[PDB]
Structure formats: structure tokens, C-alpha cells
Design a protein around this nucleic acid. Structure first.
Ligand code: G2P
Ligand code: MG
Ligand code: ZN
Ligand code: ZN
Ligand code: ZN
Lengths: 97, 112, 557, 178, 171, 84, 107, 271
DNA sequence: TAGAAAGCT
DNA sequence: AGCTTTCACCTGAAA
């Protein structure tokens, strides 16, 4: 069934923070990517069986994180990337405000 | 400041035209929202959606791709403070239930 | 159900937007993407070491990925690349590319105005990365000459020599995908009367952009790290992997490649024409022809719905669907796949009202209850109850559909040979039926209210309708003239609490919208309440006793 | 999940330069002379001598045994068997590295006592050398100031041949006669 | 060498352990992971110091599962080798190719060529030995090696060394 | 930065959301076979054990109330008034 | 302040920013005929001192940007001779509170 | 449009109303800091009527033989007469009630007395009456100090904003301004004693309830007011259509407004 | 389906 | 400079 844009809105009005996440992720979409800590991209070769994780073209074999995002966003990211845009994802912050 | 008063007067006048009653605060907020930027910032594709809120938040209304192309060009940094950007990322929004963090205190956990 | 990964699990706190550096595109790429040939190793069903898996993502399903060993679910795609024969404008940046030229010298790469001009230092002052560029542009568009010497920040007699280059600046306009200028000229001080009308090559603009000082471009929209202006022009094109452009491989010996798989092939094809065209006996006009064709294919791949008419249609008359169009709202990625989603654990049926239902309840048909499942953790509290639901089966009401071990493997209670002989274990999950008094989210689109979605109490009933209490009609805007409603089931003890503690029908009784209660006594009850409470209305003892008993909390008095 | 440090530096996109490590005291980014203790305060790098180190571990492992039996309420060849006992009690055993480290430290230790090691630490921390040099001068026994300035090439101009030769004489006097 | 580095690990507890013997488990889980560990960044993490005063901090309960993340602030003894470092160690193995020397937790290997020419291999000896016109290097002997280069390798940091230079070799 | 317990300014009373979240948290934890801090007087639903834990103010949870700027105020469920 | 009848030529107006720290203002006689401040909908706007402002900002943990903004050109900002960065405490009477204090920083 | 324009606004832990940027929209939610749910249209008795009727209802003069409270009202009535000290506390009272009236007539200029306000005071006194079995014959156990002072004290406890400093504390006053006007209007000495006929326990219970009832009424930080308000203006606009001088009105005027349309359909001045 | 914000002669 | 030229449109359910 559809939990459309309007349904999301009442869920916000309500404050049901987790319930909104649950519908969007667990009760739907939800995927697990491996991202590089240098260039916040899905570049990571995740051989999660031999515990090796690399991002050649960073040569990073250390600063790798695991993130949970909707498979649509994973898609959206790759889509924008294919159109020469870098949607870099960072697990830390720097601005503060 | 007078512009704001007129803006609400005229807003309220529509709500009360149908006879219906909406509590002051609501219209007051929309009026205040349009007002705060310094002038009459419209509830349009080029009025509010033109402000400095996050790229992912703004892209979720009207200039979807066009926004994301400018995002890349001016190398924008998304706050991930907005509801929308969290919905997109599939993270618990900082809304109601998510506006604060929960912690265990080993101290009290020992007291009991 | 994705496997355990060592990698520390975190959340996104920042999204750093930027542009792909052709150097990055190369580095990150697990292959190039040399052939337009899809796959079929010379008709042999299996991917070609040229397009869609020359290390890439993975088709086949019963085939692990060529780079990471994961395969299908667990394996996001791995990007590819295509070294273009000649640089091409990115269709989106086409305007900014032009607006950048309009601001800088088309020969030396220095800003057409600087700190020596008053209005410029004032426009340069502006803190906003877009508003700065806005003012900078409107100022520099009209400056048609790169100045060698400018009057000093003190006197007009002693003119300060800023940067060099005297060159006249072209007047740019677009011919759709082509940037063409018109240099003012001089001939006996006047002329134009007839100017110099040369078209600006991608490669020239590219070179001028490279020469734009870091300081200069940072004063314009740009950023030396993530978005240099030179990166608006495409040299190395990133090839998206299968997940993006799936091969919908129907039956067996039959393809079903995505529009984008054909558009990239079109680009590949267009590139090899231009590559050999210029390596071989270059008939020069035929190059500026094979070039413009590549600039088009790469253009329409990203955005097919451009102003300059040619719709670039698939050989079926139908236009080729751009990446841009996928993202474009009310359906498509952002709006329809991310802000809105199709969801599991949801039910919809025709609604009809019940007077012998409590306000906060919802009649749920036995079929829908037998379909909808809650994941419960085998705790010493329920350990007993749960085994009985598990024993009960997925076919008979208070029962369960699955048992999920610690081992993260599903037990299909429906078919499993051990459906009886299944002793539980704490920490396991019993996916049980939706039972009486579980919280659920009831909904009626519209959905213009905080109130158009409320949390109810399940009360399983016969017959195929959702049975709601009549007084809770008004806040949904529901009627029973053919109306259907949605029901969503929470999954965590956490999300149940969310519904129960915030979104429940009794909590919603008083509307913040209008500071007045949003539900009341309606229809039959409203009609009969007048009719009952007139001075004239009297009830005989026989009935009084029945009326009394009918009230559930009656004192017994 | 792995361990992090006090050094917070944000290398956003700009990966490298990974300038090699040498005895040009160009140690890691992590192994900076100017490091930071997790109380927020800046602190000089901690480098140890094979004994300053042996005594550190032994002590911490000993106080662990103390705390473990507290929470339970409700001669070189001879020191090797002695340490082997403590490790079997405090360490996970699977940590074969610490076992090897303790045997190496027990056999290659220059100073037997906490008084001796204490006194060594005084003598050496007078010099104003970079903790690495200071530890290496303590853990390695040298005679000629040349023997030293060759093995610790980081010294070279940092100290008078005679003065270093004075320290080396004093260090030799300290060496606990096994 | 042998450093005292201040470090921090992010450990995630399951709610089953939200009892009073919590700090007790957390501290023992830290020592599980961290102690014995080997990173290229900090080298060998051999021993966790000041067990009694390990900094727990408040643990933030994770949004969709009861687990709570603790950044356990700590301090330990680390051994991270470097090029140019002079190390005292004992031989382990011996071949035509060279000899492997045990220096603390790690092994430094010395090539037949990273040795002075006069020191020749002798296969016909129990166990194998490297014989010079003065001294003999064999399985139990002590050596002072100059680390020429390091390789960060999973559970170890192997290295190559020289005994050809002055003031180096057997001792 | 972390506002000190004395300099605290937020509602001394627990927000409708905090209450919903602590009950939801304890319930999820209790369910995940966590240690129950109260006498289950025949109780078997984690959400009712959660309310019981909350009614005796015997929940070891701490609300970190972040402020617009970033600074925050730490409050205990043991100290937050429940007029809700 | 220079109250002009009909116009000030662009020749003359170039002399307006010439003499700092002193500031020059121009008001069209025709605008002044009626006082805008006296109007029903225009409430009490008050200039804040550098100290008053520093405190307002501190007390509400604000960055100057985070403040509701008054335009430089605002009929009231002109009346009061507001300058970029100066704050106005705006006091309106509320149908909800009785009296409400707003704040506007300049642009 | 309204929702996408407001979504990110909510009450933060300082009673402020801010967006994703954290830019202040409102300083205190709905210029009073109250949740709309806990508000009922209450009557500001003080505002209307003759200055004569006002005098009759609120004036206590322990120095005049006719304007004292008859000892039928309270036990103290006999001993209360002529007390200059107490009469300064009532002069204090009546001088504030007058001040209040002049202010109310400044705000609601048409003299409209019915305003949506928290804590139903009418009900509290009504409920106290049956809760305590108030004898509309016998005299009260209250003092003039019991009333005048107790109400003054309750007011200091009606907290919306907490912070210790002028900026915040002065803002606290401002938020509670109108409620207090009503509180004083409905809890004046003559009123409490003649009309309500409350005992001390009754009056002490009325005060403890207004206190609690008020504190319940304040907005909860986290409250998603962006969407709340956007849907509150949004939903009615839909039932204007989706169901069954001459100026442009309804959906088109609303559309005209939100867009901030320059060239409007029916422009007009009201001179 | 019609309304403003770019840029045109 | 002023007219021209240029650039989103309700929610879920259906075949
Ligand atoms: N959001 C939308 N709601 C719609 C739409 N079409 C119908 N409705 C809903 O349908 C309902 C009105 O239904 P009808 O036209 O069938 C009403 P009926 O003539 O039987 O009624 P009375 O109101 O009782 O005189 C009302 O709740 C609307 O929300 C639509 O296109 N969009
Ligand atoms: Mg209907
Ligand atoms: Zn990377
Ligand atoms: Zn792969
Ligand atoms: Zn030039």
C-alpha cells in the first residue's frame, strides 16, 4: 500500500519519529551500503566474508563505515553520480551551528 | 511589521469567509514565516524553496534535478537538520520523539 | 536479508555536494567500457568483458559479482567509465559554463573586473556563494575588453596596471548545445559593421577554465576541492552499473536491456565514430559532425527533454527516458520513491460503521488478521503463549506464520517439516497474527490532518470490511458509501508505544487545529438523543432495567 | 569497529601525503611530539625503554589482578616464570603478542628496579632530546658516542660527543648486574 | 620506541547486559577487542593500562534496537616499529635467504645480502647457521638489527633489517 | 557543550514525546530480555512493565535535551515530573 | 537629514556617502506629510544598543542570521535611521498573550 | 505548498519556534507558549460594562460604611472596618484591576470579551463549589490578605519560560500578561467573597488547580508546529470546495495571497 | 492549465 | 529600459 507524501506529513505533525522511520525503512525500502570515510561514496569493495574493505582511488582500507539508507536513496545517489554529481556522505560533522 | 498585520488580516478573512474557525497561532505562524525574511517571501516554487535550507530538503519540491545540479556546482553542504533530508536518508528525524537523545546512567542502573 | 559486516555502523550527518573530477571518475571505476556490445560473448549467453560487466555489477542472479564477491542483494553496483574522444558540455551546466565565460577573459583566464572597480569589490563582498556570482556576472557581462591598465584606487591620471591581456571579448549566445560568440572587431575604429563570428569549442572553454585562478573561481560559485569550473565539461564519463540500468532478462535466451543501456551504447557508438574519424584521414567537417553527435548523445542521456526540439526518440517513436526524468517529481525517485513509498505490513478494505464498537477500536477481518504479522521476541513472559500460536499454525486465527531464530533464518510454519516439533528458544522471533488490542494506524486519504491517521485497538471480526466506530467518522471524513481505508501495523515494541502514547483516537479527541473537540455524537445517536431527552419522554421499568444493564460501567444502582 | 585517538584532523577528500617514517624523528602523524591527553590538555609523547616498559605493563597487570580479586568478593630466569603466572591470570592468553613482549622485555631489560629506572629517567630527561632518542639511549647500550650517534642517527648534532659519553658512562654504572 | 597512547573504542552492548555488572562487562569487552590487537595506525596494542580508572561515559541508546553505544576512553602500551630503528632481538629461523629475528611482538627478517659478505650460510649444521671468520649466528643467538622497512599486515607488522652497517650484527 | 545540572533551564516536567520514547525504549529493551528494575506483579507485557518501571521512577534512563545551538541538558527519568 | 521638495539630481546624490563617520539621509517632503509610525498597524519599534544586542543574541544562543530581518529600506527603519546590523525590539499587542516582543536585525 | 513551506518548524527546548537553519520564526509559540488543545474561549469580565458596574463588582472600601464587605461574607468583617493597612492592599487591588481594564481596551479595541485562553477558571470555581459544599449563607474563613496576597503568589508560579535573566524573565511576564488579566478579573476580593463564596480550603484548592492546569497547557518542545499549522489552514481550504463590496474570496483569494500576487483581481482601500 | 522571472529588440 | 521570451498544475484505489 502507499504511505505517500501526505501520510509522511501526518506522521511528522504527530511527532512519531521512529514510526515514520520504520515505515520508510523496515516496512519497505531499507538497504546497507559501505561508504568511504574520505570521499563519502559507495565506491567500497565490500568482500564481507574475508573481512576486506577497500576504496582503490583513496587506497583506504581503514576509514570505512556501514550505513543504512532506503535502496531508493542508494539508487538516487548512483543516478546523480552517473550525471557527474558527487553526493558525498559523511558520518561526522564540521560546520556546528 | 504592518505588512504582517495586513497579511494575517487578509488570511484570516478567507478562513472566516467559509465561516470556519482556525486558532490564531496557525495563520500567525504562516504569516510570520512569509514575513521574517524581510519582505513578502511567497509560498511558491521561487519564494521559500529559494532560501538557504538544505539541498536535499529543497529538491523534494518543484526544481528537483535543477536544484541538485546547482548543489554540485556551488559545492553545497547539507546540514541533515531538515525532516525531508532524514526521510531521504532513512534516519530517525529530529522531530518530536527524535528531538532529544536517550542514555543509560550506570550510576542509577546500579542504585536499583 | 543482508549479512554481518565488520565495518562500524554510522549515520549520515552531512551531504557534501560537488562535481566529479575526470581523474576521480578513472580512479573509482572498476572497468572501461570499450564496447557498445551489451553482452553475449559472440552470441554466447554471458556478459561481454566490454559493456555491462567488464568487472562492473552483476546480471545472472546465480552469479556472484566480479569485484566484490557478494552478488545481487548485498552488492550495490560498481561504477564504470568511458574515456570520451572530445570534451562535451554537461547539459545542466551549459548555462553556468556560458555565464562563467561571460565573467572571465576568453584568452588569459582572469576576471573581467576586480578590486580596482568599486561595484566589483562591493559585489565581491557578498557572503552568499550564489548572490556573489549573481552580482559578479551582471557586472562582468558588459565588460567587453580584458584590461591591461585600469585607473588607480586614487587618481585618473596615473592608471594602475593590473593583469595583462588586451584582447576583445566575444559576445556569447547559445545555438542549443553550441556556444557561439561575436567579437566586436576594430577596422578603422568602427567595424562591426560585420564582426568575427566563430563558434567556441568545448576544448577551448575547457582550457580557459583551467587557467581561471583558484582565487578567481572561488569568488564565483566554485570550490577548489569538490567543484572546479573545469569539471562542468565532461571528459571522462561515469558508466552506471546494472542496479541503475537493469537488464530485465525475460524467460531465458532473450535480453530486455534498459533505455540507459541503449543510450550508453549510442554514446559508445558515437565515440568510436569520432575516435577513428580523427585518428584516420580527418575530413575535418566530418569531425565537427561526429563531435556534435557525441555532444548530443551525452546530452540526451542525462536530460532528453531539452528546449532545442529534437526529442531523441527510441526506434519505436517513443522518446528515450533521461536520468533527469527518473528524478522528476510526483512519481519518480525523490517525490514518489523516497518521500512516499509502497509499504509491507499494510492492508486496505471497504469500511462500514459499528455502533457496538468502542471509539478507539477497529474491526479487522479474520482474513486480514491471518495475513498481517507482528514480530515478537521469545521472552520468558510469552515463551509459553508463543509456542501455542506456533503450534496453532498460520491457517487458524490466534496463530503464527514464521519463527525466526538467532541464526537469522526464516522457518516457514506454512511448509516446514518441523512445524510441530519446534521448541522455541529465548531471543527468537515468532511472527504471529495481528490480535485483539494490538495498536494499528488507520488511514483515509485525503490525509490533510494530523487526525486523518489515528492509532486504534485491533478487534478481530468476521466479514470482509473494516468496522470503525461511527463517532470517529468525522475526523477521517469517512462515510460508508463505498469508501475504503488503509491500515498499517507497527513492528517494534517502540513503534507500538509511539502509536499508543501519541496517535491514539482518545488522545486526538480535542483538535489543536480549532481548539475544539473534532469528534461528537452523530446521526442515529444524535437524532435519538433529542428524541430521548424531551420533557415528554418516559420509559417503563422493564426497559429502564435494559437501558441500565446496556451501560457497561453502570454501578448496579 | 576499531580504535581512534585524540588526533581529530579532517582530511576531507584531500587524501595523502603519506611521507615515510624514519629516525629523522619523522615518526607517524599519530606519533607526534606534541600530542593530546584525553583530559583535553596537550601532552608530550610517551616513549619507553625496555624496563621502563616492562615495569609499566607488570604494574598495570598486577593492579588488574588486584581489581579482579576485589570484584570477586561478591632473578631474570625466575622473573620469566613469575610474569608467566600473572599473564595467565590477567590476560586473555589468546594475546600471544603480550606473552612474547613480556619475555623479550624480561630478557632484554637494562634496569631491574623501579629505583634504577627512575634514576635513569632523571639522567636522560635532562638532555632535551626527543622522547624517541631518550628511550633509545636508555634501551640500547652503547660505548663510543659514535656507537650511539650511529644507532640513534637522530642525535648527530644534538649533543657534545663528550657529554653523550658522560651519560653513557653513567648509564653503564646503573645497569643492574642480573 | 614502545609508546603510551590514549585511545577510544566504540562498543555496542545488547540490552540483555543492562544490569549492574555492566561497567564490568564493558571493561572486559574492551580488553577483548583492543588487547592483543594490531593496527597499522598504532601498531601492536599489547596491554591496557589503569583498569580501575577506565572512562565509561554515558551510553546512547540506539534508535531502532535497545543496544547502547559507549565510547570507552582508555590508555595503553603500544609497540609500532619504524625504518631506521635499531633493535635488539634473538634469532628464530635460518635459511639460504637469511634469518628471522624476534623483536618484541614482531619479527624482523635479515637477507643474506643485508649481512656482510664474509658471513656465509652453513646448511650442514644442527640447527642451520650463518658463519663468519669470527662469530656464528644460529637459532638462539642475540642480534642488534637496523629496521630498513615495514609492512602493515592484518595481525602483524613484519619488517626487513640490515646487520651490514657499523655497530650492527651479533652481540 | 553540556549545560551543568545547576544552570539547567528546560521544563522540569517530561514532554509527551520523552514519555512516549522512554516507555517505548524500556518496552523494547524489556522485550529484548533486559533486566527489569521493578517487581513484576504478575506483569507480562513489556510496555506495562515499562510503565510500572516509570511509575516507580526506577528507569535508569537519561534524556539529553539538545538546544538549537547544539548545547544540551541532561535530565533523569528519576527527576522529570510526570503530570501527563 | 535633507528634506527635498520634488527631487535631488544624481549629480548631487553622489555627495551623500562623502563625509564618514557622519551620515547623510534624504527624505521626500511628500512622504513625511503623514506619519507612518502613527498608523494602527505599525507597532512600537525600538533601537538596540551594541550592548543590548550582544545580550539579546547571547540570551537566545543566536547567530545574527537566525534573527528575523528588517529591510534597510523599511519605512520604520528609515524613520529611526537604522543601520546594517542594528536590532529593533518590536512590541505588538497579542490576542493570545496581551503583549509580544519581536526582534528584527537590519539588512 | 503550505506543508513543504512549513515542515521543518518546531518548538525547541527554549520555547522558541525555528526551522532547519534554526532561524527564529516565533520567539515563543503562538505569542503565548500554549498548546492550542488546552485553550477554551473564556470571558474577560473586566473589559466591558459601565465604569459604574465595574466599580460595583470590584471595589472594596473598608473605610466607607456602605462599601466594606458585610461580616456576612467573612468572620473578619467587623474587625476589618477602617483598617488603613488592609485598605491599602485593596486600593492596590482595585488600582491594578483598573490598569488591567485600560490595557484590555487597548488590545481588543472593539470591546470583544470572549477570547480563547488556557485553564477554564469558570469550571474550576464551579467544581470547587460542589467539591466543598459551599454554604451561600455562612461567612468565609478567608482574610483580605488570604485573597489579595494568594493570587499575587499564584501568578509568580504560572511559568512558561524558565531562564534567570532580564531578557527571558521580562519575556515570561509578556507571555502570561493576558492570562493574569483574566486571573485577577476572576479572583478579586469582592468577587471571591460575594459571588463565589469560597472558604479558605476552597480558595487554596482553586489556586493549586489553576497552577497545575496552566502548567499542563504549555507547548511540548518537539511539537511539530510547521506541519500542524500548515494542515490547520490547509484542511479547511479543501472543505471550502470538495463539498456541496463584492471582493475576490475563498480558494482564489487564498491562492492570490500565498503566491503574493502583484496584479490582484479586486484591489480596494477602506478610507 | 495561466503566472512570474529570466532576457530580448 | 518595457514588452517580449521563457520556464509547476490534489490524495490513495484501479485496467
Ligand atoms: N482528495 C479527494 N477527495 C475526493 C475526490 N473525489 C471524492 N472525494 C471525497 O469524497 C467525498 C464526497 O463524496 P460524494 O460526492 O460521493 C458525497 P454525497 O453526495 O453522497 O453526499 P452529502 O455530503 O452527504 O450530501 C468527500 O469526503 C471527498 O473527500 C477527489 O478527487 N480527491
Ligand atoms: Mg464516500
Ligand atoms: Zn574513497
Ligand atoms: Zn560487486
Ligand atoms: Zn586577458
Amino acid at each position: 500500500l502507499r504511505f505517500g507524501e501526505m501520510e509522511r506529513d501526518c506522521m511528522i505533525a504527530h511527532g512519531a519519529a521512529s514510526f515514520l522511520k520504520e515505515r520508510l525503512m523496515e516496512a519497505s525500502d531499507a538497504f546497507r551500503v559501505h561508504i568511504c570515510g574520505i570521499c563519502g561514496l559507495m565506491t567500497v569493495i565490500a568482500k564481507l566474508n574475508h573481512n576486506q574493505f577497500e576504496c582503490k582511488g583513496c587506497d583506504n582500507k581503514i576509514d570505512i563505515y556501514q550505513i543504512h539508507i532506503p535502496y531508493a536513496a542508494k539508487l538516487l545517489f548512483q543516478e546523480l553520480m552517473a550525471m557527474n554529481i558527487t553526493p558525498r556522505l559523511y558520518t561526522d560533522r564540521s560546520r556546528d551551528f | 511589521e504592518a505588512g504582517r498585520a495586513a497579511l494575517y488580516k487578509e488570511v484570516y478573512n478567507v478562513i472566516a469567509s467559509d465561516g470556519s474557525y482556525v486558532n490564531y497561532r496557525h495563520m500567525a505562524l504562516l504569516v510570520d514565516v512569509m514575513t521574517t525574511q524581510g519582505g513578502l517571501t511567497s509560498v511558491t516554487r521561487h519564494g521559500f524553496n529559494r532560501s538557504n535550507t538544505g539541498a536535499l530538503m529543497r529538491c523534494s519540491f518543484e526544481e528537483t534535478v535543477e536544484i541538485l545540479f546547482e548543489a554540485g556546482a556551488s559545492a553545497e553542504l547539507d546540514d541533515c537538520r531538515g525532516v525531508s533530508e532524514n526521510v531521504i536518508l532513512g534516519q530517525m528525524a529530529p522531530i518530536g520523539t527524535g528531538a532529544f537523545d536517550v542514555m543509560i546512567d550506570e550510576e542509577s542502573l546500579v542504585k536499583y | 536479508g543482508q549479512q554481518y559486516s565488520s565495518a562500524p555502523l554510522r549515520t549520515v550527518k552531512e551531504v557534501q555536494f560537488g562535481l566529479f573530477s575526470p581523474e576521480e571518475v578513472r580512479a573509482i571505476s572498476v572497468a572501461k567500457i570499450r564496447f557498445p556490445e551489451t553482452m553475449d560473448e559472440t552470441q554466447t549467453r554471458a556478459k561481454i568483458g566490454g559493456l555491462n560487466d567488464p568487472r562492473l555489477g552483476s546480471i545472472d542472479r546465480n552469479l556472484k559479482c566480479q569485484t566484490c564477491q557478494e552478488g545481487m542483494n548485498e552488492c550495490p553496483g560498481h561504477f564504470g567509465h568511458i574515456d570520451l574522444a572530445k570534451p562535451v558540455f554537461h547539459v545542466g551546466f551549459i548555462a553556468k559554463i556560458k555565464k562563467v565565460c561571460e565573467c572571465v577573459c576568453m584568452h588569459c583566464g582572469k576576471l573581467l573586473l576586480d578590486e580596482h572597480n568599486e561595484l566589483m569589490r562591493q559585489a565581491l563582498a557578498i557572503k552568499d556563494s550564489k548572490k556573489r556570482f549573481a552580482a559578479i556576472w551582471t557586472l562582468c557581462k558588459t565588460k567587453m575588453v580584458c584590461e591591461t591598465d585600469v585607473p588607480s584606487e586614487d587618481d585618473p591620471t596615473q592608471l594602475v596596471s593590473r593583469g595583462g591581456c588586451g584582447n576583445t571579448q566575444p559576445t556569447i549566445r547559445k545555438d542549443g548545445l553550441k556556444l557561439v560568440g561575436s567579437w566586436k572587431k576594430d577596422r578603422a575604429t568602427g567595424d562591426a559593421d560585420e564582426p568575427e563570428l566563430r563558434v567556441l569549442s568545448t576544448e577551448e572553454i575547457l582550457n580557459i577554465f583551467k587557467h581561471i585562478s583558484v582565487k578567481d573561481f572561488t569568488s564565483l560559485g566554485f570550490n577548489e576541492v569538490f567543484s572546479r569550473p573545469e569539471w562542468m565539461i565532461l571528459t571522462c564519463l561515469p558508466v552506471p552499473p546494472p542496479p541503475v540500468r537493469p537488464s530485465i532478462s525475460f524467460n531465458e535466451s532473450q535480453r530486455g536491456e534498459d533505455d540507459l543501456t541503449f543510450k550508453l551504447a549510442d554514446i559508445l557508438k558515437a565515440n568510436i565514430s569520432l575516435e577513428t574519424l580523427e585518428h584516420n584521414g580527418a575530413p575535418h567537417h566530418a569531425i565537427e559532425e561526429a563531435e556534435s553527435l557525441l555532444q548530443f548523445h551525452v546530452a540526451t542521456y542525462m536530460d532528453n527533454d531539452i528546449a532545442g526540439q529534437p526529442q531523441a526518440l527510441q526506434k519505436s517513436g517513443r522518446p528515450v527516458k533521461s536520468i533527469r526524468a527518473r528524478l522528476k517529481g510526483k512519481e519518480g525517485r525523490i517525490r514518489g520513491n523516497l518521500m512516499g513509498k509502497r509499504v509491507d505490513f499494510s492492508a486496505r478494505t471497504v469500511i462500514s460503521g459499528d455502533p457496538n464498537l468502542e471509539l478507539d477500536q477497529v474491526g479487522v477481518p479474520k482474513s486480514i488478521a491471518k495475513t498481517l504479522t507482528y514480530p515478537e521476541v521469545v521472552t520468558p513472559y510469552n515463551i509459553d503463549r508463543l509456542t501455542q500460536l506456533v503450534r496453532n499454525g498460520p491457517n487458524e486465527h490466534p496463530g503464527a506464520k514464521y519463527v525466526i531464530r538467532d541464526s537469522g533464518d526464516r522457518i516457514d510454519l506454512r511448509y516446514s517439516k518441523r512445524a510441530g516439533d519446534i521448541q522455541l528458544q529465548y531471543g527468537w522471533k515468532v511472527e504471529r497474527h495481528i490480535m485483539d488490542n494490538d495498536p494499528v494506524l488507520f488511514n483515509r486519504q485525503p490525509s490533510l490532518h494530523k487526525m486523518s491517521m489515528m492509532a486504534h485497538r485491533v478487534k478481530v471480526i468476521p466479514y470482509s470490511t473494516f468496522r470503525l466506530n461511527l463517532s470517529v467518522t468525522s475526523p477521517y471524513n469517512a462515510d460508508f458509501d463505498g469508501d475504503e481505508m488503509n491500515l498499517h501495523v507497527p513492528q517494534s515494541e517502540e513503534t507500538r508505544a509511539e502509536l499508543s502514547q501519541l496517535c491514539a483516537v482518545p488522545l486526538q479527541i480535542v483538535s489543536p487545529q480549532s481548539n475544539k473537540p473534532c469528534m461528537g455524537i452523530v446521526q442515529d445517536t444524535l437524532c435519538g438523543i433529542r428524541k430521548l431527552t424531551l420533557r415528554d419522554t418516559f420509559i417503563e421499568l422493564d426497559q429502564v432495567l435494559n437501558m441500565l444493564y446496556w451501560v457497561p460501567d453502570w454501578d448496579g444502582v | 569497529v576499531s580504535t581512534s585517538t585524540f588526533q581529530t584532523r579532517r582530511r576531507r577528500l584531500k587524501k595523502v601525503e603519506e611521507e615515510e617514517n624514519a629516525a629523522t624523528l619523522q615518526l607517524g602523524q599519530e606519533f607526534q611530539l606534541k600530542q593530546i591527553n584525553h583530559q583535553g590538555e596537550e601532552e608530550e609523547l610517551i616513549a619507553l625503554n625496555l624496563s621502563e616498559a616492562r615495569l609499566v605493563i607488570k604494574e598495570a597487570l598486577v593492579e588488574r589482578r588486584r581489581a579482579f580479586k576485589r570484584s570477586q568478593k561478591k632473578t631474570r630466569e625466575k622473573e620469566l616464570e613469575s610474569i608467566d603466572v600473572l599473564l595467565e591470570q590477567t590476560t586473555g592468553g589468546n594475546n600471544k603478542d603480550l606473552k612474547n613482549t613480556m619475555q623479550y622485555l624480561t630478557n632484554f631489560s637494562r634496569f631491574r628496579d623501579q629505583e634504577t629506572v627512575g634514576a635513569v629517567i632523571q639522567l636522560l630527561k635532562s638532555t632535551g632530546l626527543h622522547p624517541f632518542e631518550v628511550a633509545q639511549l636508555g634501551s640500547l647500550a652503547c660505548d663510543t658516542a659514535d656507537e650511539a650517534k650511529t644507532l640513534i642517527p637522530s642525535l648527530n648534532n644534538k649533543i657534545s660527543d663528550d657529554e653523550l659519553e658522560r651519560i653513557l658512562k653513567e648509564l653503564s654504572n646503573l645497569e643492574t648486574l642480573y | 620506541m614502545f609508546f603510551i597512547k590514549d585511545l577510544s573504542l566504540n562498543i555496542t552492548l545488547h540490552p540483555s547486559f543492562f544490569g549492574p555488572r555492566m561497567k564490568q562487562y564493558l571493561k572486559t569487552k574492551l580488553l577483548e577487542e583492543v588487547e592483543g590487537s594490531c593496527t597499522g595506525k598504532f601498531g601492536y596494542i599489547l596491554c591496557v593500562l589503569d583498569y580501575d580508572n577506565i572512562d565509561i561515559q554515558r551510553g546512547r541508546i540506539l534508535p531502532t534496537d535497545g543496544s547502547a553505544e559507549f565510547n570507552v576512553k582508555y590508555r595503553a602500551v603500544v609497540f609500532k616499529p619504524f625504518k631506521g630503528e635499531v633493535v635488539d632481538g634473538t634469532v628464530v629461523s635460518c635459511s639460504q635467504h637469511g634469518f628471522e629475528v624476534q623483536v618484541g611482538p614482531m619479527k624482523v627478517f635479515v637477507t643474506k645480502h643485508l649481512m656482510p659478505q664474509d658471513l656465509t650460510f652453513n646448511a650442514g649444521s644442527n640447527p642451520p647457521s650463518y658463519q663468519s671468520s669470527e662469530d656464528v649466528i644460529t637459532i638462539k643467538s642475540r642480534i642488534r638489527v637496523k629496521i630498513e622497512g615495514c609492512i602493515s599486515q592484518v595481525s602483524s607488522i613484519h619488517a626487513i633489517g640490515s646487520i651490514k652497517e657499523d655497530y650492527l650484527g651479533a652481540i | 557543550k553540556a549545560i551543568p545540572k545547576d544552570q539547567r533551564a528546560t521544563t522540569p516536567y517530561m514532554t509527551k514525546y520523552e514519555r512516549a520514547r522512554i516507555l517505548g525504549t524500556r518496552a523494547l529493551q524489556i522485550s529484548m530480555n533486559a533486566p527489569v528494575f521493578v517487581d513484576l506483579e504478575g506483569e507480562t507485557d513489556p510496555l506495562r512493565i515499562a510503565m510500572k518501571e516509570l511509575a516507580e521512577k526506577k528507569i535508569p534512563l537519561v534524556i539529553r535535551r539538545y538546544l538549537p545551538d547544539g548545547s544540551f541538558e541532561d535530565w533523569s527519568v528519576e527527576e522529570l515530573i510526570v503530570d501527563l | 537629514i535633507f528634506v527635498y521638495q520634488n527631487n535631488i539630481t544624481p549629480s548631487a546624490m553622489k555627495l551623500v556617502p562623502s563625509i564618514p563617520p557622519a551620515t547623510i539621509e534624504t527624505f521626500n517632503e511628500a512622504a513625511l506629510v503623514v506619519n507612518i509610525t502613527h498608523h494602527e498597524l505599525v507597532p512600537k519599534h525600538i533601537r538596540l544598543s551594541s550592548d543590548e544586542k550582544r545580550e539579546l543574541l547571547k540570551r537566545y544562543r543566536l547567530k545574527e542570521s537566525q534573527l528575523p530581518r528588517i529591510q534597510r529600506a523599511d519605512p520604520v527603519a528609515l524613520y529611526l535611521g537604522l543601520k546594517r546590523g542594528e536590532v529593533v525590539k518590536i512590541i505588538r499587542k497579542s490576542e493570545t498573550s496581551g503583549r509580544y516582543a519581536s526582534y528584527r536585525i537590519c539588512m | 505548498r503550505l506543508v513543504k513551506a512549513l515542515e521543518d518548524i518546531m518548538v525547541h527546548y527554549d520555547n522558541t519556534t525555528r526551522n532547519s537553519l534554526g532561524n527564529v520564526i516565533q520567539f515563543i509559540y503562538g505569542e503565548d507558549g500554549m498548546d492550542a488543545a488546552h485553550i477554551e474561549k473564556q470571558s474577560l469580565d473586566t473589559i466591558g460594562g459601565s465604569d459604574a458596574a465595574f466599580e460595583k463588582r470590584y471595589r472594596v472600601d473598608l473605610l466607607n460604611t456602605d462599601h466594606t464587605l458585610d461580616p456576612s461574607l467573612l468572620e473578619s468583617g467587623s474587625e476589618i472596618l477602617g483598617d488603613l493597612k488592609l485598605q491599602v492592599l485593596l486600593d492596590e487591588e482595585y488600582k491594578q484591576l483598573v490598569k488591567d481594564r485600560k490595557f484590555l481596551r487597548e488590545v481588543f479595541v472593539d470591546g470583544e470579551a470572549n477570547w480563547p485562553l488556557p485553564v477554564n477558571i469558570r469550571r474550576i470555581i464551579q467544581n470547587a463549589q460542589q467539591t466543598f459544599h459551599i454554604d451561600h449563607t455562612k461567612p468565609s474563613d478567608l482574610t483580605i490578605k488570604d485573597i489579595v496576597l494568594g493570587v499575587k503568589d499564584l501568578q509568580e508560579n504560572l511559568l512558561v519560560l524558565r531562564g534567570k535573566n532580564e531578557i527571558i524573565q521580562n519575556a515570561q511576564r509578556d507571555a502570561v500578561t493576558l492570562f493574569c488579566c483574566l486571573l485577577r478579573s476572576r479572583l478579586a476580593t469582592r468577587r471571591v467573597l460575594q459571588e463565589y463564596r469560597l472558604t479558605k480550603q476552597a480558595f487554596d484548592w482553586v489556586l493549586s488547580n489553576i497552577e497545575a492546569q496552566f502548567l499542563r497547557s504549555v507547548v511540548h518542545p518537539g511539537e511539530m508546529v510547521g506541519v500542524l499549522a500548515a494542515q490547520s489552514i490547509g484542511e479547511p481550504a479543501t472543505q471550502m470546495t470538495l463539498n456541496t463590496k463584492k471582493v475576490t474570496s475563498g480558494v482564489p483569494r487564498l491562492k492570490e495571497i500565498l503566491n503574493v500576487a502583484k496584479n490582484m483581481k479586486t484591489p480596494s482601500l477602506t478610507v
